[PDB]
Assembly symmetry: C3
Homo-oligomer: 72 residues x 3
């Protein structure tokens, strides 16, 4: 879970409209590119946690699969 990614998505949304209405535009485009980068970084942190969480589940289910096989 991360609500920061949501806040970054809305922040790039506001910066996008300000660029579209202005189309100082170069500063809003550079500022917009920093917003997208922060969101990509925030997603990669959450995407990294989902990778570690999938590995944990694969180890937990394999321990159960091997347990039910050893009982026989």
């Amino acid at each position: 879970y991360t609500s920061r990614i949501e806040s970054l998505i809305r922040e790039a949304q506001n910066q996008q409209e300000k660029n579209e209405q202005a189309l100082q535009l170069l500063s809003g485009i550079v500022q917009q590119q920093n917003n997208l980068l922060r969101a990509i970084e925030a997603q990669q942190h959450l995407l990294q946690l989902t990778v570690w969480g999938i590995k944990q589940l694969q180890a937990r289910i394999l321990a159960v699969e091997r347990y039910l096989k050893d009982q026989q």
Copy 2:
């Protein structure tokens, strides 16, 4: 699963070449930034579903782990 993210990736790909060949460029750069934002939003929706799906699995495997412990 989401095939929309793929379509958005190809759409930013076409807009990238049009900007690289043009390098009206400001409009293609603003249009490109909206494409990347849509893809980031589409990935966050899929990344959100993968978070809920991992929690469900952790509850399902914990129910099985506790079941095999209660049987003893």
Copy 3:
């Protein structure tokens, strides 16, 4: 796992500072937009693998859930 996404995040980080200090800027902005696109594509590949991995776990845990029900 993918360390390429990390390298792409740092590469967009270096390009962001070069754009912020320059604020030839148009070329750095187009070059920055290609960096973010590569990272979005690299995350979607990893996000796709996490989707296939969650489906596999759901099938493995359902096989165990059905096994413990058939034993009764």
